[PDB]
Design an enzyme around this catalytic site. Structure first.
Site: not given
Ligand SMILES: [Ca+2]
Lengths: 248, 56
Positions: A41, A90, A180, A184, A186-187
């Site tokens: 994404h 993803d 969590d 920013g 993500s990945g």
């Protein structure tokens, strides 16, 4: 990262920073000197594919110390089963234009094998996630790399603990809105420790808002993709910046 | 033997053949000790090892 601590410089040597036109875009994980695993994404709305950069050895975003390493992303590979705008599968495999030079601050994270990861790593309770993302929902991202230790749940237990979660994902984290990973992040890597060695088990994906109470974090289950990842890493480069490879 | 339980005692990867016959292995950059289960780095920066902590 919400509810974490700063990763001391050097102790997250595989973390990667993805930039578009110089702007923070995503995190990623170094698994070899030319290969970076990230999240599909992260590229859904990519501006100019010819401006994608991976930065290894990064710690504090406001100072250059000479340890940082910059490389042009030459190719971004995405499973065929991934649907932009959605969240299943993803995962993204990036090929750097030139290799990063391994140093005390730039080190790859072991990509484990399918079996080992499913029957042994998949059971280690606590793993680490990191990134320079938001420090609070709707808050500002971080200047120094952040890391947070989170507990992995069973797909069954995750569903119930919340009254959308394929087997290509797994939940982890906490439901009390205190800890969590955010946009920013993500990945970025979900890393597991086993017998003196870290291995890549998850990729920071989506999740209902950031640190949203009554919710857990969703991470791509890397294990479902080792073989896919490996076949591609052992193949010869085909022309093109964005490529979709079949999956399984 | 079959190495499904406790990772067959292997530090890293193992695989079990026939019956009672097993074999531990290591990710690249590593070698298996005479020990049979342990992996020892073969390059300066083996994957998953953190130099600043490693060097103590
Ligand atoms: Ca810096």
């Amino acid at each position: 990262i919400v509810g974490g601590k700063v990763c001391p410089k050097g102790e997250c040597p595989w973390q990667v920073l993805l930039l578009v036109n110089g702007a923070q875009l995503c995190g990623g994980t170094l698994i070899n000197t030319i290969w970076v695993v990230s999240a599909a994404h992260c590229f859904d709305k990519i501006k100019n594919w010819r401006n994608l950069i991976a930065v290894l050895g990064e710690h504090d975003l406001s100072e250059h110390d000479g340890d940082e390493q910059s490389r042009r992303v030459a190719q971004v590979i995405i499973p065929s089963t991934y649907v932009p705008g959605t969240t299943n599968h993803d995962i993204a495999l990036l090929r750097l234009h030139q290799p990063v030079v391994l140093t005390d601050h730039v080190v790859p994270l072991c990509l484990p094998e399918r079996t080992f990861s499913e029957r042994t790593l998949a059971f280690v309770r606590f793993s680490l996630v990191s990134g320079w993302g938001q420090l609070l929902d709707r808050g500002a991202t971080a200047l120094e790399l952040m890391v947070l230790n989170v507990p992995r749940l069973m797909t069954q237990d995750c569903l119930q603990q919340s009254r959308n979660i394929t087997e290509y994902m797994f939940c982890a984290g906490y439901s009390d809105g205190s800890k969590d990973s955010c946009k920013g992040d993500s990945g970025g890597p979900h890393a597991t420790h086993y017998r003196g060695t870290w291995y890549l088990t998850g990729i920071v994906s989506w999740g209902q808002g950031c640190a949203t109470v009554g919710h857990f974090g969703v991470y791509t289950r890397v294990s479902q993709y080792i073989e896919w990842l490996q076949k591609l890493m052992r193949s010869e480069p085909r022309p093109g910046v964005l490529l979709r490879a079949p999956f399984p | 033997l079959i190495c499904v339980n406790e990772n067959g005692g292997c530090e890293q990867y193992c695989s079990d053949h026939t019956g009672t016959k097993r074999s531990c292995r290591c990710h690249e950059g590593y070698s298996l000790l005479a020990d049979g289960v342990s992996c020892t780095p073969t390059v300066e920066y083996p994957c998953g090892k953190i130099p600043i902590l490693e060097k103590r």
